């Protein structure tokens, strides 16, 4: 019968009350590296056509990612578009926008970056509305993979944001063209896990469940757009290995402005295509008059790390008698580490290679495996 | 007051009728547009057709809006003479009895969202009411009722949603369920011989 | 269907119609299918994905919704009515458009027809509203009202199938036949009026379950499983994953187109070892003003060379007049356009269409001609 | 999977085995072997159908009296649900025994 | 401006220096590239008073930091031996005396076991071990805005042919130093005029690539093309002469490749059609209809 | 001129129905 101001006070203060940190985060840090000891070089499609379907409808209006959810989804696709292509050069990618029930395409199929991007800028300052069709989109990819050809992967990655979507028919008749197709699809979505994204995900990628991906947060969802760069791990019932004739151009040198034979606009530059001798303006592309397959030895180049991965290095055990006092490849002196007074050298920073048993720091560890993907001890031993 | 139109905006609103083939009918249109992602609503009775046997399992359930506890005509002349013989005859009181019948109702209403320990789904009991019957829930709702969520109003109420909603729609570590929620054949003997 | 290749081939009104919507193509349909000679079917082969996307871009259509709803007015009320706004009325309520046939081209105007229609009782009981009496309806639309319950009766004979005795609520209450107990009360039951009869509330519930079955079943169309639903699949096995694994052989062949002896390796690695000791005079590296002369013109031309090249490294600015420009880029297209065609057939590589090889080799050396 | 609970085998027809499940074949088989009534509430969610089926099967068959059961349900579409449960168990019971027992379960409703 | 890390990749083997000298008329060259290099030295760390150098030797047997010291081998120690003269800048002399001491600890480790001949060179271990550094100190950022750039001093000598097995840590590094913008700097003292992958490596990274000849004079390279800062690498054009072709070598024929196929799963760059249908590097069947196809004669009427 | 090539469009497509008459 009393009233809430002649309660007792709160006494917020009074509520505050007040090493082994180390340990602590190195437990977690365990479990984070516990993760990734499944590792295998599972064969990946390199040549990949990944249609990138986004959401712009009214679900992209509400503010709970910072600052809306169709600024920073465009920003982060932006992204996205510049280390897909620069980790998958080989591979084309076509943009696609859910709007107002239509899907719309906003860029073919192409193996240019550049495009992309100023097509997600034209969206960008656009305002997102009306309800989404996840069938109208499909359809769209599915039309847009149809001249894919057999040895390049056809993948369809979807920032779905709504939970609910209107389909003009049946959407299961689309899954099972999208499975006939061999489409895998993809979807990362925003708010839950929606019932018939889950369904596509598991039912294109051959019964695998883990394609369906749901953010957290701004970090979560950045690692899952940084995901989905790496090729997808193909399945062994698919038999579609074949030879793919290529060309490699050699770098043409003139000061003279010559007609590209792609854009048909001057340019001073080029590449000479080593079948049918027209020159185009980047790479790796297509030729536009020979319909060969033009790239360079680095656009190959950057994708073995892919076909066999580094093993990932182990912990060094505490008691273990330590080879070096200092880093292997970086020389910086790994130091005492102890976590409590009578902690001595626990967790100690080292990180031996499988194979050449050598001696790494945490910077070393997080760098050979991420930016190199090679181990110079590995190199070093004198096989 | 175009409440309606506003939900029709995202699911389609399929309501209980009191014919039982036009029920049916609703009943599979709710799950053909719960299968297919359009998203569907189903306004049924606690104590109707649909109430029992009926399972609502993964994509079928993920909300139990429970408008209301669902107490009986309390005035009908059938419920007071059963209720006069029960506490005549049993010592149960009246007011005891009529919440334990309600509350029984609102369970079964509770237990048709779940099929398996990988399905989730929320529980929303929308009257003042329930807050004091919180005892006389089952046993294993009740431990999964937290003490600050027996007096929400619809806010934070839709915010602990979204954030359930966000929480498991990521995917579940095996290790931390691999003898701990479900046993193998290797759990269950280890278990079996440490009974003993 | 009508996305193959050959459909999309034989479209002459899709292709007119995307010419008239693109104006850059047209520069070189003109120059090529027509000023050139080069058949359109050949010049839509290699094209098929644009032909395709300009082909989705217009065949498909929004999902079906409760347009109704989204209707509602804003004295003076206005409403926005959208053509796809009028399609999606007519689709979900054919009985809309069966009255928009026979009298609007017949008796009045179509916006004075919408303006009745709004204002009707039909538009009331098709948007789930209550019907009273005492509003006025509109008596042009009205007629059609026992027409409409017609189409809702005839609505009813294509949705009621028999269903799986898993959702079975019908035979549910049809388990125990016999069973005559407690009638149920007037809470368990549909509300009635003072007389007795049924007060309509039950109407609008089964015209909105109508609404969303007849939304469920026109995705039913050309655009054993007891135990599947019955299963727990968290209890069954994890899936396991059938990714391929590699292993590359790393013994490649070597590319194609005077050892020394550990007595002489000692001596010389000696002989590095005396001449770090006895003097490292790092005032010897100092050319002797002749190698020097050979060493910078020899990265004065390098860098000359470079540079020359890296001079001059949006299309470049012209010497040429826009009209000469202009034509030699046309000129240039419709080259490249005829070489992409000879190509595609040059290693398509049957021998069936080697007459249409001949024809592109014939016009290429028009085309050399032309240059 | 297949299991002993005492002396009683059990076949689980899944590989894996909630706690709960296996706390309620316990539950039962006491009840069963004491011979009284019983109240059991499994939480909602588990297989508290596959429970039940699985170890009176079990109970039924490896016991040699071969007790009939009869498994009282509120409505007709939980008999059919409780009768597609007890159709994969007894699949499951035939490919790990190798054989189909001789053994009869039908589902009983009106002529309608 | 900005001061930037200069890490020297230098590959001091024995055997390839050996017959290098055994080529020209002169001995002893790993004294002039090295005394060249350390002129070389002295001049960048007087370009800035920030500015570090970073050194590693590819030995037959591996790799080792010359400078600065291990720091086990700095907890241990100081013999200051008397190879350089101790009346010049105290700064230039720490590195001078920290680079010979290792030269002559790392040329006794190569005398002690010079029994074992080794064919794996490992100048790509040691241009990885530079970029690992180099990413160190980028990272630890004691000095902020700390430029880099990368220094590879090989020779040829005419003995080495060309090793396939080196390619992909080559292109590796590429893009490491592509992707922390850090040039590539090769200096190639040997008959071979060309060497393939580290041109690639001195195009695809920004760097200069100059092939030399006769270790005399060298200091005149270093200190006109090899200079180039980071921070004027745009306003400074390269005399990087002999541009790549940026091809590759077919694996089981070896020559460089033209038009060729490749393998869609391990991507082997395969000049013909293998034999038996099978890729030789990924061991996966190739369908005998998709080769066929491209076994198809070009068409042309009779 | 747009209006012209609309034009030979149409006179081409004229020819194109004469070709199936
Ligand atoms: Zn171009
Ligand atoms: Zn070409
Ligand atoms: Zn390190
Ligand atoms: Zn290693
Ligand atoms: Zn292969």
Redesign the pocket.
């Given at each position: 019968g009393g009233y809430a101001w002649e309660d007792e006070i709160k006494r917020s203060w009074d509520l505050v009350k007040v090493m082994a940190s180390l340990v602590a985060s190195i437990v977690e840090a365990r479990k984070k590296r516990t993760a990734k000891k499944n590792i295998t070089p599972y064969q990946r499609g390199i040549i990949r056509s990944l249609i990138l379907t986004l959401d712009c409808s009214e679900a992209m209006l509400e503010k709970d990612l910072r600052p809306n959810r169709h600024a920073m989804i465009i920003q982060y696709a932006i992204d996205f578009v510049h280390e897909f292509f620069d980790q998958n050069p080989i591979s084309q990618m076509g943009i696609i926008i859910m709007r107002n029930g239509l899907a719309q395409l906003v860029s073919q199929v192409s193996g240019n970056p550049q495009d992309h991007i100023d097509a997600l800028k034209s969206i960008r300052k656009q305002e997102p509305k009306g309800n989404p069709s996840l069938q109208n989109a499909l359809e769209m990819a599915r039309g847009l993979l149809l001249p894919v050809p057999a040895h390049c992967t056809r993948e369809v990655l979807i920032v779905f944001g709504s939970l609910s979507t209107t389909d003009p028919g049946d959407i299961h008749q689309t899954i099972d063209s999208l499975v006939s197709e061999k489409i895998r699809v993809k979807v990362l979505g925003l708010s839950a896990q929606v019932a018939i994204c889950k369904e596509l995900c598991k039912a294109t990628n051959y019964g695998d469940e883990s394609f369906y991906k749901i953010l957290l947060d701004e970090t979560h969802l950045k690692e899952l757009f940084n995901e989905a760069v790496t090729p997808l791990p193909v399945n062994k019932i698919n038999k579609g290995f074949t030879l793919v004739k290529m060309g490699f151009p050699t770098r043409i040198f003139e000061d003279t402005p010559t007609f590209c034979s792609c854009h048909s606009k001057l340019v001073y530059g080029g590449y000479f295509?080593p079948?049918?001798h027209?020159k185009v303006c980047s790479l790796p592309t297509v030729?536009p008059?020979?319909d060969?397959m033009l790239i360079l030895s680095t656009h190959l180049a950057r994708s073995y790390h892919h076909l066999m991965p580094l093993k990932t290095f182990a912990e060094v055990p505490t008691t273990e008698k330590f080879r070096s006092e200092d880093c292997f490849s970086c020389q910086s002196r790994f130091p005492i580490l102890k976590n409590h007074k009578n902690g001595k050298l626990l967790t100690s920073s080292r990180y031996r290679c499988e194979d050449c048993k050598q001696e790494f720091c945490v910077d070393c560890d997080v760098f050979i495996h991420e930016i190199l993907h090679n181990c110079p001890g590995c190199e070093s031993k004198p096989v | 007051m175009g409440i309606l139109d506003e939900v029709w905006k995202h699911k389609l609103i399929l309501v209980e009728t009191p014919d039982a083939q036009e029920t049916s009918l609703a009943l599979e249109t709710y799950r053909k547009a719960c299968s297919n992602g359009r998203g569907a609503i189903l306004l049924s009775v606690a104590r109707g057709k649909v109430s029992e046997g009926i399972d609502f399992d993964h994509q079928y359930g993920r909300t139990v809006l429970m408008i209301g506890i669902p107490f009986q005509y309390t005035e009908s002349r059938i419920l007071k003479a059963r209720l006069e013989f029960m506490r005549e005859n049993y010592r149960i009181r009246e007011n005891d009895f009529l919440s334990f019948d309600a509350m029984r109702h609102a369970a079964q209403c509770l237990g048709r969202v779940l099929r398996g320990k990988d399905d989730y789904g929320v529980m929303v009991l929308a009257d003042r009411r329930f807050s004091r019957k919180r005892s006389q829930l089952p046993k294993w709702i009740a431990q999964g009722l937290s003490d600050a969520d027996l007096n929400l109003s619809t806010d934070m109420a839709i915010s602990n949603t979204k954030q359930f909603l966000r929480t498991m729609a990521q995917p579940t570590d095996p290790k931390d369920q691999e003898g701990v929620s479900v046993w193998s054949y290797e759990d269950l003997i280890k278990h079996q011989n440490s009974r003993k | 269907d009508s996305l193959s290749k050959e459909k999309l081939l034989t479209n002459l009104k899709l292709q007119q119609s995307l010419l008239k919507g693109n104006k850059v193509l047209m520069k070189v349909f003109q120059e090529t299918v027509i000023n050139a000679g080069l058949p359109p079917s050949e010049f839509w082969s290699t094209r098929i994905p644009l032909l395709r996307a300009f082909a989705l871009s217009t065949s498909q259509k929004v999902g079906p919704y409760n347009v109704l709803s989204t209707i509602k007015p804003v004295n003076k009320v206005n409403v926005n009515l959208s053509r796809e706004k009028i399609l999606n009325i007519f689709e979900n309520y054919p009985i809309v458009k069966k009255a928009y046939t026979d009298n609007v081209p017949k008796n009045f105007k179509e916006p004075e027809f919408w303006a009745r229609f709004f204002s009707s009782k039909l538009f009331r009981k098709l948007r789930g509203e209550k019907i009273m009496q005492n509003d006025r309806g509109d008596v042009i639309i009205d007629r059609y009202l026992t027409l409409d319950q017609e189409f809702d009766r005839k609505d009813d004979d294509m949705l009621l199938h028999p269903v799986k005795k898993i959702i079975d609520l019908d035979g549910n209450i049809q388990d125990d036949p016999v069973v005559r107990g407690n009638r149920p009360d007037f809470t368990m039951q549909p509300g009635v009026d003072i007389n007795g009869n049924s007060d309509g509330t039950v109407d609008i519930l089964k015209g909105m379950n109508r609404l969303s079955e007849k939304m469920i079943m026109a995705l039913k169309n050309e655009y054993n499983d007891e135990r599947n639903e019955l299963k727990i699949d968290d209890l069954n096995e994890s899936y396991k994953t059938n990714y391929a694994i590699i292993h590359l052989k790393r013994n490649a062949h070597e590319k194609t187109t005077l050892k020394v002896s550990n007595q002489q390796m000692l001596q010389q690695l000696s002989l590095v070892m005396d001449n770090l000791i006895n003097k490292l005079d790092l005032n010897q590296v100092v050319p002797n003003n002749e190698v020097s002369n050979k060493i910078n013109k020899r990265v004065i031309t390098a860098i000359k060379i470079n540079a020359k090249q890296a001079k001059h490294n949006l299309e470049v600015k012209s010497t040429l007049p826009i009209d000469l420009l202009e034509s030699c880029r046309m000129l240039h297209t419709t080259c490249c356009e005829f070489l992409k065609h000879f190509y595609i057939h040059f290693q398509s590589g049957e021998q069936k269409q080697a007459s249409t090889v001949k024809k592109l080799y014939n016009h290429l050396k028009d085309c050399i001609e032309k240059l | 999977m297949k299991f002993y609970i005492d002396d009683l085998p059990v076949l689980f027809p899944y590989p894996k085995i909630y706690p709960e499940q296996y706390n309620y074949m316990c539950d039962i088989k006491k009840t069963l072997d004491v011979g009284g009534n019983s109240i059991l509430e499994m939480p909602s969610g588990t297989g508290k159908t596959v429970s039940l089926l699985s170890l009176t099967i079990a109970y039924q068959m490896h016991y040699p009296e071969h007790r009939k059961i009869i498994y009282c349900s509120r409505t007709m579409s939980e008999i059919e649900k409780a009768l597609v449960e007890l159709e994969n168990l007894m699949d499951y019971r035939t490919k790990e025994l190798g054989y189909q027992e001789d053994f009869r379960g039908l589902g009983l409703t009106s002529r309608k | 401006e900005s001061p930037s890390l200069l890490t020297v990749i230098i590959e001091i083997a024995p055997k390839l220096w050996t017959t290098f000298d055994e080529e020209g008329n002169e001995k002893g060259s790993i004294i002039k590239v090295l005394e060249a290099l350390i002129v070389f030295l002295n001049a960048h760390l007087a370009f800035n008073s920030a500015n570090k150098v970073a050194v590693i030797a590819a030995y037959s047997q591996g790799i080792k930091y010359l400078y600065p010291e291990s720091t086990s081998a700095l907890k241990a120690s100081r013999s200051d031996l008397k190879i350089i003269n101790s009346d010049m800048y105290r700064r230039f002399r720490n590195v001078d005396e920290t680079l010979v001491e290792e030269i002559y600890k790392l040329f006794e480790l190569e005398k002690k076991q010079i029994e074992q001949n080794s064919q794996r060179s490992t100048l790509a271990g040691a241009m990885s071990a530079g970029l690992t550094y180099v990413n160190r100190i980028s990272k630890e950022s004691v000095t902020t805005s700390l430029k880099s750039r990368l220094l590879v001093l090989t020779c040829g000598s005419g003995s080495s042919k060309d090793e396939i097995f080196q390619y992909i840590p080559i292109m590796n590094c590429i893009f490491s130093a592509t992707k922390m913008k850090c040039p590539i700097d090769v200096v190639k003292i040997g008959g071979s005029k060309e060497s393939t992958f580290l041109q690639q490596t001195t195009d695809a990274t920004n760097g200069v690539y100059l092939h030399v000849e006769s270790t005399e004079g060298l200091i005149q390279y270093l200190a006109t093309a090899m200079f180039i800062d980071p921070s004027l690498r745009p306003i400074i054009v390269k005399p990087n002469h002999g541009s790549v072709d940026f091809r590759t070598s077919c694996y089981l024929t070896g020559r460089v490749v033209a038009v060729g196929f490749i393998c869609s799963v391990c991507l082997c760059v395969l000049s013909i059609i293998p034999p038996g249908n099978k890729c030789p590097a990924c061991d996966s069947q190739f369908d005998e209809h998709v080769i066929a196809k491209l076994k198809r004669k070009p068409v042309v009427p009779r | 001129e747009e209006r012209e090539n609309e034009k030979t469009l149409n006179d081409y497509y004229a020819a194109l129905a004469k070709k199936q008459a």
């Open positions: 295509c079948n049918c027209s030729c008059c020979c060969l | - | - | - | - | -």
